Amino acid sequence: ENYHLKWDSHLTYLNSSIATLYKNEKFADVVLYSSYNSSGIPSDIPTVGISAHKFILSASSQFFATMFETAPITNPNGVLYVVLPPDLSHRAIQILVQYMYSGEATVSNDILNEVLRGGEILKIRGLCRT
Amino acid sequence: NYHLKWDSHLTYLNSSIATLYKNEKFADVVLYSSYNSSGIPSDIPTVGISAHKFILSASSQFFATMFETAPITNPNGVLYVVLPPDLSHRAIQILVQYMYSGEATVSNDILNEVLRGGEILKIRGLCRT
Amino acid sequence: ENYHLKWDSHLTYLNSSIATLYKNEKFADVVLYSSYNSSGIPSDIPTVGISAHKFILSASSQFFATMFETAPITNPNGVLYVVLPPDLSHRAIQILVQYMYSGEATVSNDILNEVLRGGEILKIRGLCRT
Amino acid sequence: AENYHLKWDSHLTYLNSSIATLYKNEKFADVVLYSSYNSSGIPSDIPTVGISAHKFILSASSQFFATMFETAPITNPNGVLYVVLPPDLSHRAIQILVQYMYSGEATVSNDILNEVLRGGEILKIRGLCRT
Amino acid sequence: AENYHLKWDSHLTYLNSSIATLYKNEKFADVVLYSSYNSSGIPSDIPTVGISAHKFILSASSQFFATMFETAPITNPNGVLYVVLPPDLSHRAIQILVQYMYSGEATVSNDILNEVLRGGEILKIRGLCRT
Amino acid sequence: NYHLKWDSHLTYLNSSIATLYKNEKFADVVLYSSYNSSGIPSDIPTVGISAHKFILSASSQFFATMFETAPITNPNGVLYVVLPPDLSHRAIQILVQYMYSGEATVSNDILNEVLRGGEILKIRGLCRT
């Protein structure tokens, strides 16, 4: 009494499509701000806001998940701005976002030591001890 | 320099997007049907189906161009998309199931409605190219 | 003692102010994008949807009323965005709105069949076939 | 080459009937009215309760509110406007004037009529105020 | 185990100083005050200069705003909230009244004095309102 | 020319700010611990702590710069702040109580986490400059 609409290639077009959101940023709702506080206040008063998508963050990081679930919700259809621990440089946050969007990132020899710590504190899957 | 990766990103991501269909978290669009609310009685219009912009954009060329040509430039607001009358509320929900999980079991009676709607909205995998 | 007050010319002034309302656009809180997709839009410049007001829509369209009163997720305050079926062009929706505001629109015969269909789609009083 | 007046006879009656439903309902309200109560000869300002109203009706039915909402611009879609009405206006008088602009008819107790009529003169409401 | 007690007695001084500086830097402001008038009904200057203020001081000083924010029929989560005060307060008077709540002191010309006192009375502002 | 006085301004005001320590009324920023790096088995133990922007900018050189440097270009958004790894939920509440009310009593075991946080957050009376 039923037919079945299979589609083998769904996941593959989903993979290619999502990966662009690391680059075209369309439908972004989360803006991540760095707090490294490197070399004085006046250099980056308009701090560069990293664009991100809530669902990716919740999927890849437990810390973002428990946040978006239990956090006090104020604007359900407006942007959220989040500013990350001062231990994390802006390039580190960019690498982490890339890794959360591709699952596969390259990192300079002088940023790996920090990205691992960021992932551990952000409980990003693939970077947690847990 | 170092290359950082882990074994299985797509499995967890696919599992997450799978539930996103039913946990309805983070929705950004609302889908309504002009199709007959049981006909004359007007009793039961499609109250609305909440969805996610990035999925309908990724898997439907109609919805993608809709979201590109119809910008919600305000700081806040949810897109109330009213679809053509071809799409009964059953058809809309099944097609959204398909745009999420890449699969949909379909009852025989609505086959000619869903196979139609998929081409109407050009959902990849349903639409004939 | 109990007392009574009334205004005779209330109705005419009110309705005439309403007629001008969509022209001056004051207090508009709905935007009706028109996805007519004529011959295939290559994601060109935005269609510039029509401004409208919720109270008049819901007082005229039996469908817009339900859409506005019970949307599963809603914008709490301020402008709201609707995009209409591909059946209805920007000109038709523009005429179809003026009709709901003023009760009459000098529709052209050449698009009469699109306006007449559109009324049933939005179940607009005066046009709805029921 | 030809045109037609697509028209409805009962639009005016249906619409007026669908607007008189508003003030008795919170639907689509976009302004909230307050006042110094004048509850006991000396206003009681603590217990004030906002009265939801609609810009599109106040602006047409009274001139004071029109220039208010005109010259107090809406700088954000998410902005909600509250109006602190003059102290001479009690909540009940404001309660009725909120009806008067919608229903076009009101019945009042004589003990407030002399403050409600003055309120009409202040807010420059059609029918009540001179022009 | 020890329940050691922290303090620095100059804290409240710095808190007050920061609030006083808040008055003129206007950062983190979330509520904007307008003054109702027909004066701006002419092409020369239609849009009123909306005064910025902070929610927490208004409720801290004025119980009228305290209620206006504690309970209201509708509200916004995070967007700035706009209020227009009665026509009895000119822009100078409302600015002075904001200063008084913000810092507890002010200076007024005698031609400003009466209007400021009356407006503060209606706004239930501590130190001006009599009861 | 004339002058206004309100001698009870501060005392009334101070009481009306201590109260804000308890309730979200007028809250502007949310502080989240990140302390699980300490080895805690939990997934996430914390739920965002509510705070008011202007107060933290008053007491903290770290926050006072931060809320200035975070643009919040969207006027209808709100700010979530992830505090450093070293600061637990318990310790931050003591730090905020100190920030909001000028006094806090801290257990000897958390003493070296509240005091440590003070320099990490450059909160005056705990920071060394």
Author numbering:
A (entry chain B), C (entry chain F): 4 to 133
B (entry chain A), F (entry chain C): 5 to 133
D (entry chain E), E (entry chain D): 3 to 133
Would you copy out the relevant sentences from the publication that reported this structure?
The Tramtrack group (TTK) is a distinct type of BTB domain, which can multimerize. Thus, the TTK-type BTB domains are a structurally and functionally distinct group of protein domains specific to Arthropodan transcription factors.
To enhance particle contrast on cryo-EM images, we used the BTB domain of CG67651-133 fused to MBP (40 kDa), which resulted in a monomer Mw of 56 kDa. Iterative masked refinement excluding flexible MBP regions resulted in a final reconstruction of core CG67651-133 multimer at a resolution of 3.3 Å (full data processing flowchart is shown at Figure 3—figure supplement 1). CG6765 hexamer consists of three canonical BTB dimers with extensive hydrophobic molecular contacts and main-chain hydrogen bonds (N78, V82, Y84, V86) forming a β-sheet between two parallel β4-strands. Furthermore, a few inter-dimer hydrogen bonds are formed between (i) T50 and T73, (ii) N78 and N80, and (iii) side chain hydroxy group of Y36 and P75/M70 main chain atoms. Residues with large hydrophobic or aromatic side-chains at positions corresponding to Y84 and V86 of CG6765 are characteristic for all TTK-type BTBs, whereas residues involved in stabilizing interactions at B1/A2 and adjacent loops are less conserved. The N-terminal TTK-motif is located within the first β-strand and is involved only in intra-dimer stabilization forming antiparallel beta-sheet with B4. Central part of the hexamer forms a pore, residues of loop regions surrounding the pore are not conserved, thus it is unlikely that it can possess some physiological function.
